[PDB]
Design the sequence.
Protein backbone atom coordinates (compact mmCIF):
# COMPACT_ATOMS: atom_id res chain seq x y z
CA UNK A 1 0.00 0.00 0.00
CA UNK A 2 1.11 3.57 -0.70
CA UNK A 3 0.34 4.59 2.89
CA UNK A 4 2.63 1.92 4.33
CA UNK A 5 5.36 2.69 1.79
CA UNK A 6 5.27 6.38 2.71
CA UNK A 7 5.34 5.45 6.40
CA UNK A 8 8.42 3.27 5.88
CA UNK A 9 10.17 6.02 3.90
CA UNK A 10 9.41 8.54 6.65
CA UNK A 11 10.79 6.19 9.31
CA UNK A 12 13.98 5.57 7.32
CA UNK A 13 14.49 9.30 6.75
CA UNK A 14 13.98 9.97 10.47
CA UNK A 15 16.61 7.35 11.32
CA UNK A 16 19.03 8.95 8.86
CA UNK A 17 18.36 12.39 10.36
CA UNK A 18 19.07 11.09 13.87
CA UNK A 19 22.33 9.48 12.74
CA UNK A 20 23.46 12.68 11.03
CA UNK A 21 22.61 14.76 14.11
CA UNK A 22 24.68 12.42 16.28
CA UNK A 23 27.58 12.69 13.84
CA UNK A 24 27.35 16.49 13.90
CA UNK A 25 27.45 16.62 17.70
CA UNK A 26 30.43 14.24 17.81
CA UNK A 27 32.21 16.34 15.17
CA UNK A 28 31.71 19.53 17.20
CA UNK A 29 33.01 17.80 20.33
CA UNK A 30 36.14 16.71 18.45
CA UNK A 31 36.59 20.18 16.94
CA UNK A 32 36.77 21.61 20.46
CA UNK A 33 39.69 19.32 21.32
CA UNK A 34 41.38 20.08 17.99
CA UNK A 35 41.20 23.80 18.76
CA UNK A 36 42.64 23.11 22.22
CA UNK A 37 45.57 21.25 20.64
CA UNK A 38 46.11 24.12 18.20
CA UNK A 39 46.21 26.57 21.11
CA UNK A 40 48.63 24.34 23.03
CA UNK A 41 51.10 23.98 20.15
CA UNK A 42 51.79 27.73 19.82
CA UNK A 43 54.67 28.43 22.29
CA UNK A 44 57.04 25.75 20.98
CA UNK A 45 56.59 26.89 17.38
CA UNK A 46 57.03 30.53 18.39
CA UNK A 47 60.25 29.81 20.29
CA UNK A 48 61.76 27.66 17.55
CA UNK A 49 60.81 30.24 14.90
CA UNK A 50 62.47 33.02 16.89
CA UNK A 51 65.61 30.93 17.43
CA UNK A 52 65.93 29.92 13.77
CA UNK A 53 65.26 33.49 12.60
CA UNK A 54 68.03 34.74 14.89
CA UNK A 55 70.56 32.05 13.99
CA UNK A 56 70.10 31.29 10.27
CA UNK A 57 70.45 34.82 8.87
CA UNK A 58 72.49 37.66 10.34
CA UNK A 59 74.62 35.39 12.52
CA UNK A 60 76.48 33.94 9.53
CA UNK A 61 76.29 32.63 6.00
CA UNK A 62 74.57 29.62 4.46
CA UNK A 63 76.46 26.89 6.29
CA UNK A 64 73.95 24.13 5.55
CA UNK A 65 72.45 22.83 2.27
CA UNK A 66 68.94 23.17 3.72
CA UNK A 67 69.34 26.97 3.60
CA UNK A 68 70.41 27.17 -0.07
CA UNK A 69 68.65 25.91 -3.18
CA UNK A 70 70.17 23.31 -5.49
CA UNK A 71 69.29 22.41 -9.09
CA UNK A 72 66.01 20.53 -9.30
CA UNK A 73 66.02 16.85 -10.27
CA UNK A 74 63.11 15.48 -8.22
CA UNK A 75 60.22 16.92 -6.21
CA UNK A 76 58.64 15.64 -3.00
CA UNK A 77 54.93 16.20 -2.38
CA UNK A 78 53.34 15.74 1.04
CA UNK A 79 49.54 15.52 1.16
CA UNK A 80 47.39 15.35 4.30
CA UNK A 81 43.95 13.76 3.91
CA UNK A 82 41.37 12.25 6.22
CA UNK A 83 41.31 8.50 6.80
CA UNK A 84 37.49 8.46 6.61
CA UNK A 85 35.33 10.27 4.09
CA UNK A 86 31.84 11.64 4.82
CA UNK A 87 33.17 15.22 4.82
CA UNK A 88 32.19 17.79 2.22
CA UNK A 89 34.88 18.26 -0.44
CA UNK A 90 37.58 18.28 2.26
CA UNK A 91 39.75 15.61 0.64
CA UNK A 92 38.40 16.29 -2.85
CA UNK A 93 39.70 19.86 -3.08
CA UNK A 94 43.20 18.94 -1.90
CA UNK A 95 43.48 15.90 -4.15
CA UNK A 96 42.17 17.78 -7.19
CA UNK A 97 44.52 20.73 -6.67
CA UNK A 98 47.52 18.44 -6.16
CA UNK A 99 46.72 16.37 -9.25
CA UNK A 100 46.10 19.47 -11.38
CA UNK A 101 49.36 21.11 -10.30
CA UNK A 102 51.30 17.89 -10.87
CA UNK A 103 49.90 17.42 -14.37
CA UNK A 104 50.16 21.07 -15.43
CA UNK A 105 53.63 21.89 -14.05
CA UNK A 106 55.33 18.54 -13.50
CA UNK A 107 54.80 14.76 -13.87
CA UNK A 108 57.57 13.35 -15.87
CA UNK A 109 57.28 9.62 -15.03
CA UNK A 110 60.23 9.79 -12.58
CA UNK A 111 60.36 13.50 -11.66
CA UNK A 112 58.27 13.51 -8.46
CA UNK A 113 57.25 11.62 -5.35
CA UNK A 114 54.24 11.59 -3.02
CA UNK A 115 54.00 11.36 0.77
CA UNK A 116 50.47 10.26 1.66
CA UNK A 117 48.70 10.80 4.98
CA UNK A 118 45.26 9.20 4.83
CA UNK A 119 43.47 6.19 3.39
CA UNK A 120 41.57 8.45 0.97
CA UNK A 121 44.83 9.77 -0.45
CA UNK A 122 46.27 6.26 -0.56
CA UNK A 123 43.30 4.99 -2.57
CA UNK A 124 43.35 8.03 -4.87
CA UNK A 125 47.05 7.77 -5.72
CA UNK A 126 46.91 3.98 -6.06
CA UNK A 127 43.95 4.16 -8.44
CA UNK A 128 45.65 6.87 -10.52
CA UNK A 129 48.95 4.92 -10.39
CA UNK A 130 50.81 7.84 -8.83
CA UNK A 131 54.12 6.70 -7.29
CA UNK A 132 54.26 6.89 -3.49
CA UNK A 133 57.32 6.50 -1.26
CA UNK A 134 56.19 7.00 2.35
CA UNK A 135 52.89 6.12 3.99
CA UNK A 136 51.02 6.67 7.25
CA UNK A 137 47.38 5.99 8.16
CA UNK A 138 45.05 5.36 11.12
CA UNK A 139 46.25 8.49 12.89
CA UNK A 140 44.34 9.40 16.06
CA UNK A 141 41.62 12.03 15.96
CA UNK A 142 44.02 14.21 17.99
CA UNK A 143 47.48 13.13 16.83
CA UNK A 144 50.53 13.60 19.03
CA UNK A 145 54.05 14.56 18.03
CA UNK A 146 55.35 11.03 18.66
CA UNK A 147 52.89 9.66 16.09
CA UNK A 148 54.34 11.58 13.12
CA UNK A 149 57.87 12.16 14.42
CA UNK A 150 59.11 9.08 12.56
CA UNK A 151 57.53 10.04 9.24
CA UNK A 152 58.71 13.65 9.51
CA UNK A 153 62.24 12.47 10.30
CA UNK A 154 62.15 10.09 7.33
CA UNK A 155 60.99 12.91 5.04
CA UNK A 156 63.73 15.24 6.30
CA UNK A 157 66.36 12.54 5.85
CA UNK A 158 65.15 11.73 2.34
CA UNK A 159 65.42 15.41 1.43
CA UNK A 160 68.89 15.68 2.99
CA UNK A 161 70.12 12.57 1.14
CA UNK A 162 69.50 14.21 -2.25
CA UNK A 163 66.62 11.98 -3.33
CA UNK A 164 64.66 15.14 -4.19
CA UNK A 165 65.81 18.75 -4.26
CA UNK A 166 62.60 20.48 -3.14
CA UNK A 167 59.60 19.50 -1.03
CA UNK A 168 56.02 20.79 -1.12
CA UNK A 169 53.11 20.18 1.23
CA UNK A 170 49.36 20.53 0.70
CA UNK A 171 46.60 20.65 3.31
CA UNK A 172 43.40 22.42 4.30
CA UNK A 173 43.72 25.57 6.40
CA UNK A 174 41.14 26.31 9.08
CA UNK A 175 39.55 29.77 9.21
CA UNK A 176 36.01 29.29 10.56
CA UNK A 177 33.29 26.65 10.67
CA UNK A 178 32.58 27.30 6.97
CA UNK A 179 35.86 28.21 5.24
CA UNK A 180 38.55 25.57 4.62
CA UNK A 181 41.01 26.73 1.96
CA UNK A 182 43.69 24.58 0.35
CA UNK A 183 47.14 26.04 1.04
CA UNK A 184 50.46 25.27 -0.65
CA UNK A 185 53.76 25.63 1.21
CA UNK A 186 57.31 25.28 -0.09
CA UNK A 187 58.56 23.42 2.97
CA UNK A 188 62.13 22.92 1.72
CA UNK A 189 64.68 24.13 1.38
CA UNK A 190 63.87 27.03 3.74
CA UNK A 191 63.63 29.60 0.95
CA UNK A 192 61.77 32.19 3.05
CA UNK A 193 62.51 32.92 6.70
CA UNK A 194 61.03 35.80 8.68
CA UNK A 195 63.06 38.44 10.50
CA UNK A 196 62.97 38.54 14.31
CA UNK A 197 63.09 41.90 16.08
CA UNK A 198 64.82 40.69 19.28
CA UNK A 199 68.19 40.17 17.53
CA UNK A 200 69.87 38.15 20.28
CA UNK A 201 73.23 36.46 19.69
CA UNK A 202 74.47 33.55 21.80
CA UNK A 203 77.99 32.20 22.19
CA UNK A 204 77.87 29.13 19.96
CA UNK A 205 79.37 25.97 21.48
CA UNK A 206 80.40 24.36 19.23
CA UNK A 207 80.42 26.45 16.04
CA UNK A 208 77.17 27.27 14.26
CA UNK A 209 77.53 24.39 11.78
CA UNK A 210 76.37 21.67 14.17
CA UNK A 211 73.86 24.06 15.77
CA UNK A 212 72.14 24.56 12.41
CA UNK A 213 72.51 20.88 11.48
CA UNK A 214 70.59 19.94 14.64
CA UNK A 215 68.11 22.82 14.59
CA UNK A 216 66.82 22.64 11.01
CA UNK A 217 65.27 19.12 11.11
CA UNK A 218 63.40 20.06 14.28
CA UNK A 219 62.07 23.18 12.54
CA UNK A 220 60.85 21.10 9.59
CA UNK A 221 59.20 18.55 11.90
CA UNK A 222 57.47 21.33 13.85
CA UNK A 223 56.14 22.82 10.61
CA UNK A 224 54.81 19.41 9.56
CA UNK A 225 53.12 18.94 12.95
CA UNK A 226 51.48 22.37 12.77
CA UNK A 227 50.14 21.65 9.29
CA UNK A 228 48.80 18.32 10.55
CA UNK A 229 46.97 20.00 13.43
CA UNK A 230 45.43 22.57 11.09
CA UNK A 231 44.31 19.79 8.74
CA UNK A 232 42.66 17.87 11.59
CA UNK A 233 40.77 20.98 12.72
CA UNK A 234 39.61 21.65 9.15
CA UNK A 235 38.46 18.04 8.76
CA UNK A 236 36.38 18.19 11.93
CA UNK A 237 34.78 21.51 10.95
CA UNK A 238 33.95 20.21 7.46
CA UNK A 239 32.36 17.06 8.87
CA UNK A 240 30.24 19.15 11.25
CA UNK A 241 29.01 21.40 8.44
CA UNK A 242 28.22 18.44 6.17
CA UNK A 243 26.22 16.74 8.92
CA UNK A 244 24.21 19.90 9.61
CA UNK A 245 23.35 20.23 5.92
CA UNK A 246 22.34 16.56 5.80
CA UNK A 247 20.00 17.05 8.78
CA UNK A 248 18.34 20.04 7.12
CA UNK A 249 17.81 18.10 3.89
CA UNK A 250 16.37 15.15 5.82
CA UNK A 251 13.89 17.41 7.62
CA UNK A 252 12.71 18.94 4.34
CA UNK A 253 12.26 15.46 2.85
CA UNK A 254 10.31 14.44 5.96
CA UNK A 255 7.79 17.25 5.63
CA UNK A 256 7.39 16.73 1.87
CA UNK A 257 6.64 13.08 2.61
CA UNK A 258 4.14 13.90 5.38
CA UNK A 259 2.09 15.90 2.88
CA UNK A 260 1.73 12.83 0.64
CA UNK A 261 1.00 10.68 3.69
CA UNK A 262 -1.94 12.92 4.59
CA UNK A 263 -3.25 12.80 1.02
CA UNK A 264 -3.04 9.00 0.90
CA UNK A 265 -4.72 8.71 4.31
CA UNK A 266 -7.67 10.78 3.13
CA UNK A 267 -7.94 8.74 -0.08
CA UNK A 268 -7.89 5.44 1.83
CA UNK A 269 -10.58 6.57 4.28
CA UNK A 270 -12.80 7.75 1.42
CA UNK A 271 -12.40 4.48 -0.48
CA UNK A 272 -13.12 2.34 2.58
CA UNK A 273 -16.26 4.24 3.57
CA UNK A 274 -17.51 4.21 -0.04
CA UNK A 275 -17.03 0.44 -0.27
CA UNK A 276 -18.82 -0.16 3.03
CA UNK A 277 -21.78 2.02 2.05
CA UNK A 278 -22.02 0.39 -1.39
CA UNK A 279 -22.01 -3.07 0.18
CA UNK A 280 -24.75 -2.00 2.58
CA UNK A 281 -26.84 -0.56 -0.26
CA UNK A 282 -26.42 -3.74 -2.31
CA UNK A 283 -28.74 -5.61 0.07
CA UNK B 1 9.82 -4.38 -31.40
CA UNK B 2 12.92 -3.70 -29.25
CA UNK B 3 14.70 -6.97 -30.01
CA UNK B 4 18.23 -7.64 -31.30
CA UNK B 5 16.94 -9.46 -34.39
CA UNK B 6 14.60 -6.59 -35.37
CA UNK B 7 16.33 -3.27 -34.69
CA UNK B 8 19.91 -4.52 -34.86
CA UNK B 9 22.59 -5.58 -32.41
CA UNK B 10 24.19 -2.14 -32.12
CA UNK B 11 20.82 -0.44 -31.61
CA UNK B 12 19.83 -2.96 -28.94
CA UNK B 13 23.14 -2.62 -27.09
CA UNK B 14 23.03 1.18 -27.12
CA UNK B 15 19.44 1.22 -25.88
CA UNK B 16 20.23 -1.25 -23.09
CA UNK B 17 23.27 0.75 -21.96
CA UNK B 18 21.27 4.00 -21.95
CA UNK B 19 18.51 2.39 -19.89
CA UNK B 20 21.05 0.93 -17.46
CA UNK B 21 22.81 4.24 -16.84
CA UNK B 22 19.47 6.05 -16.47
CA UNK B 23 18.34 3.45 -13.92
CA UNK B 24 21.56 3.90 -11.94
CA UNK B 25 21.11 7.68 -11.97
CA UNK B 26 17.52 7.25 -10.76
CA UNK B 27 18.71 5.00 -7.93
CA UNK B 28 21.31 7.55 -6.81
CA UNK B 29 18.65 10.28 -6.44
CA UNK B 30 17.92 9.76 -2.74
CA UNK B 31 21.60 9.84 -1.77
CA UNK B 32 22.10 12.92 -3.95
CA UNK B 33 19.20 14.68 -2.22
CA UNK B 34 20.33 13.76 1.30
CA UNK B 35 24.13 14.02 1.26
CA UNK B 36 24.94 15.58 -2.11
CA UNK B 37 27.46 14.85 -4.83
CA UNK B 38 30.39 14.87 -2.40
CA UNK B 39 29.74 11.35 -1.07
CA UNK B 40 29.46 9.55 -4.41
CA UNK B 41 32.25 7.21 -5.45
CA UNK B 42 34.55 8.10 -8.33
CA UNK B 43 32.60 6.13 -10.95
CA UNK B 44 29.21 7.32 -9.67
CA UNK B 45 30.30 10.88 -10.49
CA UNK B 46 30.88 9.70 -14.06
CA UNK B 47 27.52 7.90 -14.11
CA UNK B 48 25.70 11.09 -13.08
CA UNK B 49 27.77 13.16 -15.52
CA UNK B 50 26.82 10.91 -18.45
CA UNK B 51 23.21 10.42 -17.35
CA UNK B 52 22.36 14.12 -17.13
CA UNK B 53 23.70 14.71 -20.65
CA UNK B 54 21.84 11.65 -21.97
CA UNK B 55 18.58 12.81 -20.40
CA UNK B 56 18.98 16.31 -21.85
CA UNK B 57 19.90 14.94 -25.29
CA UNK B 58 16.73 12.82 -25.28
CA UNK B 59 14.77 16.07 -25.71
CA UNK B 60 13.98 17.45 -29.15
CA UNK B 61 12.51 20.46 -30.94
CA UNK B 62 9.34 19.80 -32.92
CA UNK B 63 8.06 21.17 -36.21
CA UNK B 64 4.66 21.91 -34.67
CA UNK B 65 6.29 23.89 -31.83
CA UNK B 66 7.84 26.49 -34.16
CA UNK B 67 4.83 28.83 -33.91
CA UNK B 68 5.30 29.08 -30.13
CA UNK B 69 9.11 29.30 -29.86
CA UNK B 70 10.61 30.08 -33.29
CA UNK B 71 12.77 26.96 -33.40
CA UNK B 72 12.46 25.51 -36.93
CA UNK B 73 12.39 21.90 -35.68
CA UNK B 74 14.29 18.81 -36.74
CA UNK B 75 13.86 15.28 -38.09
CA UNK B 76 16.56 12.93 -36.76
CA UNK B 77 17.08 9.55 -38.48
CA UNK B 78 17.43 6.48 -36.30
CA UNK B 79 20.99 5.85 -37.50
CA UNK B 80 22.00 9.38 -36.48
CA UNK B 81 20.28 8.94 -33.12
CA UNK B 82 22.09 5.67 -32.43
CA UNK B 83 25.45 7.12 -33.50
CA UNK B 84 25.01 10.19 -31.31
CA UNK B 85 23.99 8.20 -28.25
CA UNK B 86 26.87 5.77 -28.76
CA UNK B 87 29.29 8.70 -28.98
CA UNK B 88 27.84 10.19 -25.79
CA UNK B 89 28.13 6.84 -24.00
CA UNK B 90 31.75 6.47 -25.12
CA UNK B 91 32.64 9.73 -23.36
CA UNK B 92 33.44 11.76 -26.48
CA UNK B 93 31.46 14.83 -25.35
CA UNK B 94 32.14 14.79 -21.61
CA UNK B 95 33.63 18.30 -21.63
CA UNK B 96 30.67 20.15 -23.16
CA UNK B 97 28.19 21.84 -20.80
CA UNK B 98 24.94 19.99 -20.26
CA UNK B 99 22.83 22.90 -21.55
CA UNK B 100 24.25 22.34 -25.04
CA UNK B 101 22.29 19.06 -25.26
CA UNK B 102 18.90 20.56 -24.46
CA UNK B 103 16.82 21.06 -27.61
CA UNK B 104 19.06 20.49 -30.63
CA UNK B 105 18.45 17.27 -32.53
CA UNK B 106 21.49 15.83 -34.30
CA UNK B 107 24.74 15.39 -32.40
CA UNK B 108 26.54 18.07 -34.43
CA UNK B 109 24.01 20.66 -33.28
CA UNK B 110 25.26 20.05 -29.73
CA UNK B 111 28.78 21.07 -30.76
CA UNK B 112 27.44 24.06 -32.68
CA UNK B 113 25.39 25.22 -29.68
CA UNK B 114 28.32 24.81 -27.29
CA UNK B 115 30.63 26.74 -29.63
CA UNK B 116 28.02 29.49 -29.95
CA UNK B 117 27.78 29.68 -26.16
CA UNK B 118 31.56 30.03 -26.03
CA UNK B 119 33.11 26.63 -25.34
CA UNK C 1 9.52 18.12 43.15
CA UNK C 2 7.69 17.01 40.00
CA UNK C 3 8.84 19.84 37.73
CA UNK C 4 12.57 19.16 37.89
CA UNK C 5 11.93 15.45 37.38
CA UNK C 6 9.87 16.24 34.28
CA UNK C 7 12.61 18.49 32.89
CA UNK C 8 15.31 15.87 33.49
CA UNK C 9 13.21 13.14 31.89
CA UNK C 10 12.51 15.35 28.86
CA UNK C 11 16.22 16.07 28.41
CA UNK C 12 17.11 12.39 28.73
CA UNK C 13 14.43 11.42 26.21
CA UNK C 14 15.80 14.03 23.81
CA UNK C 15 19.39 12.79 24.15
CA UNK C 16 18.71 9.07 24.69
CA UNK C 17 19.41 7.91 21.13
CA UNK C 18 23.05 9.08 21.36
CA UNK C 19 23.96 7.49 24.70
CA UNK C 20 26.66 5.16 23.32
CA UNK C 21 28.97 8.13 22.57
CA UNK C 22 31.24 8.87 25.51
CA UNK C 23 33.05 11.49 23.42
CA UNK C 24 30.21 14.03 23.65
CA UNK C 25 30.42 17.33 25.53
CA UNK C 26 31.84 16.34 28.90
CA UNK C 27 29.86 19.05 30.72
CA UNK C 28 26.28 19.17 29.44
CA UNK C 29 25.48 15.94 27.60
CA UNK C 30 27.31 13.59 29.98
CA UNK C 31 25.62 15.07 33.05
CA UNK C 32 22.20 14.96 31.38
CA UNK C 33 22.68 11.31 30.42
CA UNK C 34 23.89 10.40 33.91
CA UNK C 35 20.88 12.08 35.52
CA UNK C 36 18.44 10.55 33.03
CA UNK C 37 19.67 7.00 33.52
CA UNK C 38 19.18 7.27 37.28
CA UNK C 39 15.77 8.88 36.74
CA UNK C 40 14.68 5.96 34.56
CA UNK C 41 15.99 3.48 37.13
CA UNK C 42 14.11 5.30 39.91
CA UNK C 43 10.84 5.33 37.96
CA UNK C 44 10.88 1.52 37.72
CA UNK C 45 8.64 -0.43 40.07
CA UNK C 46 7.90 -4.00 41.14
CA UNK C 47 4.60 -5.71 40.40
CA UNK C 48 1.75 -5.57 42.95
CA UNK C 49 3.81 -3.40 45.34
CA UNK C 50 2.38 0.13 45.52
CA UNK C 51 4.44 2.81 47.25
CA UNK C 52 3.14 5.39 49.76
CA UNK C 53 3.05 8.98 48.55
CA UNK C 54 5.39 10.24 51.28
CA UNK C 55 8.06 7.69 50.35
CA UNK C 56 7.59 8.55 46.67
CA UNK C 57 8.10 12.24 47.48
CA UNK C 58 11.22 11.52 49.52
CA UNK C 59 12.84 9.27 46.91
CA UNK C 60 12.09 11.65 44.05
CA UNK C 61 13.48 14.54 46.12
CA UNK C 62 16.65 12.54 46.76
CA UNK C 63 16.98 11.77 43.05
CA UNK C 64 16.34 15.36 41.94
CA UNK C 65 18.68 16.97 44.49
CA UNK C 66 21.73 15.12 43.17
CA UNK C 67 22.23 12.79 46.14
CA UNK C 68 22.08 9.80 43.77
CA UNK C 69 24.70 11.10 41.33
CA UNK C 70 27.43 8.89 42.81
CA UNK C 71 25.31 5.75 43.27
CA UNK C 72 25.72 3.30 40.37
CA UNK C 73 22.83 2.96 37.93
CA UNK C 74 22.67 -0.78 38.62
CA UNK C 75 22.55 -0.16 42.39
CA UNK C 76 19.91 2.61 42.24
CA UNK C 77 17.15 0.06 42.91
CA UNK C 78 18.91 -1.37 45.96
CA UNK C 79 19.57 2.18 47.15
CA UNK C 80 15.83 2.82 46.93
CA UNK C 81 14.93 -0.38 48.80
CA UNK C 82 17.31 0.22 51.70
CA UNK C 83 16.30 3.90 51.71
CA UNK C 84 12.69 2.83 52.27
CA UNK C 85 13.85 0.48 55.03
CA UNK C 86 15.93 3.23 56.67
CA UNK C 87 12.95 5.58 56.40
CA UNK C 88 10.44 3.23 58.01
CA UNK C 89 13.06 2.51 60.68
CA UNK C 90 14.14 5.99 61.80
CA UNK C 91 12.51 8.77 59.73
CA UNK C 92 9.09 8.51 61.30
CA UNK C 93 9.06 12.21 62.19
CA UNK C 94 9.60 13.18 58.54
CA UNK C 95 7.01 10.66 57.36
CA UNK C 96 4.43 11.89 59.87
CA UNK C 97 5.11 15.53 59.00
CA UNK C 98 4.60 14.83 55.30
CA UNK C 99 1.45 12.80 55.95
CA UNK C 100 -0.12 15.39 58.27
CA UNK C 101 0.87 18.59 56.44
CA UNK C 102 1.04 17.57 52.73
CA UNK C 103 4.21 19.70 52.58
CA UNK C 104 7.93 19.02 52.57
CA UNK C 105 9.78 18.93 55.92
CA UNK C 106 12.80 21.06 56.78
CA UNK C 107 15.38 20.96 54.00
CA UNK C 108 18.33 20.71 56.38
CA UNK C 109 16.75 17.83 58.30
CA UNK C 110 15.95 15.97 55.08
CA UNK C 111 19.48 16.50 53.76
CA UNK C 112 20.99 15.30 57.04
CA UNK C 113 18.82 12.17 56.94
CA UNK C 114 19.82 11.44 53.34
CA UNK C 115 23.52 11.92 54.10
CA UNK C 116 23.24 9.71 57.19
CA UNK C 117 21.68 6.95 55.08
CA UNK C 118 24.37 7.37 52.42
CA UNK C 119 27.00 6.90 55.13
CA UNK C 120 25.69 3.42 55.97
CA UNK C 121 24.83 2.48 52.37
CA UNK C 122 27.18 -0.02 50.71
CA UNK C 123 28.00 0.04 46.99
CA UNK C 124 28.68 -3.17 45.08
CA UNK D 1 26.61 -27.34 -5.34
CA UNK D 2 23.92 -24.67 -4.87
CA UNK D 3 23.30 -25.04 -1.13
CA UNK D 4 25.55 -22.07 -0.34
CA UNK D 5 24.43 -19.81 -3.21
CA UNK D 6 21.55 -18.33 -1.19
CA UNK D 7 23.96 -17.39 1.60
CA UNK D 8 26.33 -15.92 -0.99
CA UNK D 9 23.63 -13.72 -2.52
CA UNK D 10 22.31 -12.69 0.90
CA UNK D 11 25.78 -11.56 1.98
CA UNK D 12 26.34 -9.76 -1.33
CA UNK D 13 23.07 -7.83 -1.13
CA UNK D 14 23.52 -6.99 2.56
CA UNK D 15 27.01 -5.60 1.99
CA UNK D 16 26.21 -3.83 -1.30
CA UNK D 17 23.26 -2.07 0.36
CA UNK D 18 25.78 0.37 1.85
CA UNK D 19 29.28 -0.53 0.60
CA UNK D 20 29.17 2.08 -2.18
CA UNK D 21 29.60 4.79 0.48
CA UNK D 22 30.54 3.01 3.72
CA UNK D 23 34.24 2.72 2.81
CA UNK D 24 34.58 -0.09 5.35
CA UNK D 25 36.87 -1.92 2.88
CA UNK D 26 37.43 -4.85 5.23
CA UNK D 27 39.15 -7.78 3.53
CA UNK D 28 36.29 -10.21 4.14
CA UNK D 29 33.74 -7.65 2.94
CA UNK D 30 35.75 -7.02 -0.23
CA UNK D 31 36.05 -10.75 -0.94
CA UNK D 32 32.32 -11.24 -0.35
CA UNK D 33 31.46 -8.31 -2.62
CA UNK D 34 33.67 -9.63 -5.42
CA UNK D 35 32.22 -13.14 -5.09
CA UNK D 36 28.67 -11.80 -5.10
CA UNK D 37 29.29 -9.62 -8.14
CA UNK D 38 30.77 -12.59 -10.00
CA UNK D 39 27.79 -14.75 -9.02
CA UNK D 40 25.31 -12.09 -10.19
CA UNK D 41 27.16 -11.86 -13.50
CA UNK D 42 27.05 -15.66 -13.79
CA UNK D 43 23.30 -15.89 -13.14
CA UNK D 44 22.39 -13.81 -16.21
CA UNK D 45 20.94 -15.54 -19.25
CA UNK D 46 19.68 -14.84 -22.77
CA UNK D 47 16.16 -15.28 -24.10
CA UNK D 48 15.25 -18.66 -25.61
CA UNK D 49 18.65 -20.11 -24.64
CA UNK D 50 18.09 -23.12 -22.37
CA UNK D 51 21.10 -25.05 -21.09
CA UNK D 52 21.37 -28.59 -19.68
CA UNK D 53 21.22 -29.22 -15.95
CA UNK D 54 24.64 -30.90 -16.02
CA UNK D 55 26.24 -27.79 -17.51
CA UNK D 56 24.44 -25.64 -14.94
CA UNK D 57 25.82 -27.88 -12.19
CA UNK D 58 29.33 -27.52 -13.60
CA UNK D 59 29.17 -23.73 -13.98
CA UNK D 60 27.83 -23.05 -10.49
CA UNK D 61 30.41 -25.55 -9.19
CA UNK D 62 33.17 -23.52 -10.85
CA UNK D 63 31.70 -20.30 -9.45
CA UNK D 64 31.31 -21.58 -5.88
CA UNK D 65 34.71 -23.28 -5.73
CA UNK D 66 36.34 -19.90 -6.41
CA UNK D 67 38.11 -20.95 -9.61
CA UNK D 68 36.84 -17.83 -11.43
CA UNK D 69 37.63 -15.42 -8.58
CA UNK D 70 40.45 -13.88 -10.66
CA UNK D 71 38.37 -13.52 -13.85
CA UNK D 72 37.13 -9.98 -14.59
CA UNK D 73 33.39 -9.46 -14.18
CA UNK D 74 33.01 -8.26 -17.77
CA UNK D 75 34.90 -11.39 -18.87
CA UNK D 76 32.79 -13.75 -16.73
CA UNK D 77 30.09 -14.25 -19.37
CA UNK D 78 32.60 -14.96 -22.14
CA UNK D 79 34.32 -17.32 -19.69
CA UNK D 80 31.03 -19.19 -19.24
CA UNK D 81 30.42 -19.41 -22.99
CA UNK D 82 33.96 -20.67 -23.60
CA UNK D 83 33.55 -23.17 -20.75
CA UNK D 84 30.41 -24.57 -22.37
CA UNK D 85 32.22 -24.81 -25.71
CA UNK D 86 35.21 -26.49 -24.04
CA UNK D 87 32.96 -29.01 -22.29
CA UNK D 88 31.30 -29.72 -25.63
CA UNK D 89 34.67 -31.15 -26.76
CA UNK D 90 36.58 -32.34 -23.68
CA UNK D 91 35.29 -33.61 -20.37
CA UNK D 92 32.18 -35.05 -22.02
CA UNK D 93 32.48 -38.11 -19.78
CA UNK D 94 31.79 -35.85 -16.80
CA UNK D 95 28.54 -34.76 -18.46
CA UNK D 96 27.64 -38.38 -19.21
CA UNK D 97 28.33 -39.39 -15.60
CA UNK D 98 26.22 -36.52 -14.26
CA UNK D 99 23.31 -37.26 -16.58
CA UNK D 100 23.48 -40.99 -15.79
CA UNK D 101 23.95 -40.94 -12.00
CA UNK D 102 22.40 -37.58 -10.96
CA UNK D 103 25.53 -36.88 -8.90
CA UNK D 104 28.81 -34.99 -9.14
CA UNK D 105 31.83 -36.73 -10.70
CA UNK D 106 35.14 -37.19 -8.90
CA UNK D 107 36.24 -33.82 -7.55
CA UNK D 108 39.89 -34.09 -8.63
CA UNK D 109 39.08 -34.81 -12.29
CA UNK D 110 36.61 -31.92 -12.43
CA UNK D 111 39.13 -29.61 -10.77
CA UNK D 112 41.90 -30.53 -13.21
CA UNK D 113 39.56 -30.11 -16.20
CA UNK D 114 38.58 -26.67 -14.88
CA UNK D 115 42.26 -25.78 -14.45
CA UNK D 116 43.04 -26.93 -18.00
CA UNK D 117 40.23 -24.79 -19.42
CA UNK D 118 41.38 -21.85 -17.29
CA UNK D 119 44.91 -22.22 -18.66
CA UNK D 120 43.67 -22.36 -22.25
CA UNK D 121 41.35 -19.39 -21.62
CA UNK D 122 42.53 -15.97 -22.81
CA UNK D 123 41.90 -13.36 -20.12
CA UNK D 124 41.18 -9.91 -21.55
Sequence:
Amino acid sequence: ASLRDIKTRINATKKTSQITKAMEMVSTSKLNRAEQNAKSFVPYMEKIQEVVANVALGAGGASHPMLVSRPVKKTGYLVITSDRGLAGAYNSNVLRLVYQTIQKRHASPDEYAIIVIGRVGLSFFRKRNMPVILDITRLPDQPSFADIKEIARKTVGLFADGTFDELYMYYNHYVSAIQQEVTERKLLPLTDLAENKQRTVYEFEPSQEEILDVLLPQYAESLIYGALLDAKASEHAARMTAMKNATDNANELIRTLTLSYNRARQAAITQEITEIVAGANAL
Amino acid sequence: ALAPEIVGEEHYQVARKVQQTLQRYKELQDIIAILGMDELSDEDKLVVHRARRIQFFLSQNFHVAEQFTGQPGSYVPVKETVRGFKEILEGKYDHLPEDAFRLVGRIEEVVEKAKAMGV
Amino acid sequence: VAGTLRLDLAAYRELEAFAQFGSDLDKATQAKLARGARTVEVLKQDLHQPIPVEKQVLIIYALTRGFLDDIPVEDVRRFEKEFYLFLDQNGQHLLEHIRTTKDLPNEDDLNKAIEAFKKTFVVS
